[PDB]
Design a binder for this molecule. Structure first.
Ligand code: HEM
Ligand SMILES: [Cl-]
Length: 393
């Protein structure tokens, strides 16, 4: 009933161009079995959405990577929020919801937008830049560690730690094992920055620790919750911004539209998240036998959701492979869906919006003028290097 496929969704060959293989996964059926890793796969929008919105049946507490925590030790203590199910999930989720709240965005927006405008001004002075290192990476590094309240020393550890976390979701291939091999110093830095004295007042980290007063989290829970914001947030936002620039470079008509109406900045970033889906994949584990799209999956089985494929499923999207900054993007799963939907999505959309706004107001053209190079990660899709020439407006 269920087709078996030999496609390795974590192969370098696959990362180089996933889109043909994703149609193959979508069209083979609503539920596939991937023989290479012994997991079920769902690549159509409808089934991905169904799995995300039934956390009771498709739990996260047994891990959202390939590894099943009922069978193997996690490579690090479990996240109190990503790797938890309701009800244990609920109060740490509420805390991070308040730490990264609609009202909190007001406190940071002016400084985030000023840093984005200043970065664009700086890059226009240079002309030909690397839109990854010099923009997609430089800008979040210039705002988020400060907004966290991190000290300056040691920040070189943040990007290697983030890439490790997302490689560790993958299967035990060389990408993952090389990442854990090099992990000890980055792990040591992050855990130490999670302690309350090392987090500057008014920042996200201090604010998490302040919630230990309310009964929502205990003092001994705060460091692990801070860890969440030093694990998630950087690489996806970097890849999202780099994806936006990439699209604006390859689809100049959309840059011209954005220039003519800079208020499209926020949706242009959201369309970039759907179009490239920085978070490509996530696992769930069945807590029972379940019927999913005509297929029967037993208990304790790993289910791989293809988020990026779901975002390009023609059964849901008109012209899915076109970048359209006026698309009705509501309902894409680039941030997930349901109880675990990205709690930091307001931070990400804010960083993305103000950067695209600065480009929309300050740049006339963005032209690729060098070899484009892809960055390989078990879970993240993004670019290594994007040489562009910026033309001032
Ligand atoms: C373009 C940027 C981003 C993308 C594409 C993205 C993607 C995602 C996705 C797909 C999930 C779902 C996890 C699941 O369903 O198991 C998630 C959850 C999460 N994200 Fe984001 N994220 C982004 C930015 C951020 C930022 C900026 C932060 C923090 C400031 C953050 C923190 C978190 C946390 C803590 C969770 C776990 C939430 C929970 O389990 O309830 N993310 N993210
Ligand atoms: Cl760790």
């Amino acid at each position: 009933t269920i087709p078996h496929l030999a496609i390795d969704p974590f192969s370098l060959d696959f990362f180089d161009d996933p889109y043909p293989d994703q149609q193959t996964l979508r069209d083979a059926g609503p539920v596939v079995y991937l023989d290479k890793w012994n997991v079920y796969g769902v690549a159509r929008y409808a089934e991905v959405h169904a799995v995300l919105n039934d956390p009771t049946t498709f739990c996260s507490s047994r891990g959202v990577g390939l590894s099943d925590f009922k069978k193997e030790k996690p490579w690090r203590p479990p996240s109190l929020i990503l790797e938890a199910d309701p009800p244990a999930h609920t109060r740490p989720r509420a805390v991070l919801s308040k730490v990264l709240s609609p009202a909190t965005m007001k406190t940071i927006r002016d400084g985030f937008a000023a840093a984005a405008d200043a970065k664009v001004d700086e890059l226009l002075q240079r002309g030909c830049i690397d839109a990854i290192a010099d923009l997609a990476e430089a800008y979040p590094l210039s705002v988020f560690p400060d907004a966290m309240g991190l000290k300056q020393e040691g920040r070189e550890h943040l990007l290697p730690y983030a890439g490790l976390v997302f490689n560790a979701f993958g299967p035990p291939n060389e990408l993952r094992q090389t990442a854990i091999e090099r992990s000890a110093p980055h792990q040591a830095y992050v855990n130490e920055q999670c302690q309350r004295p090392n987090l500057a007042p008014g920042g996200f980290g201090a604010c998490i620790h302040a919630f230990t007063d309310t009964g929502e989290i205990t003092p001994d829970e705060a460091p692990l919750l801070v860890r969440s914001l030093l694990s998630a947030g950087l690489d996806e936002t970097v890849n999202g911004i780099g994806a936006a620039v990439y699209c604006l470079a390859r689809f100049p008509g959309e840059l011209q539209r954005l220039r003519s109406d800079p208020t499209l900045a926020r949706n242009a970033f959201e369309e970039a998240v759907r179009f490239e889906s920085p978070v490509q994949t996530f696992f769930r584990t069945t807590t029972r036998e379940v019927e999913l799209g005509g297929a029967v999956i037993g208990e304790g089985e790993k289910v791989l959701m293809f988020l990026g494929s779901a975002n390009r499923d023609p059964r849901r999207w008109s012209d899915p492979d076109l970048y359209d900054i006026t698309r009705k993007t509501s309902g894409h799963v680039g941030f997930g869906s349901g109880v675990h939907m990205c709690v930091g999505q307001l931070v990400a959309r804010l960083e993305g919006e103000v950067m695209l706004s600065a480009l929309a107001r300050k740049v006339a053209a963005i032209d690729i003028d060098g070899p484009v190079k892809r960055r390989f990660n078990n879970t993240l899709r993004g670019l290594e290097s994007l040489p562009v020439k910026l033309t001032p407006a």
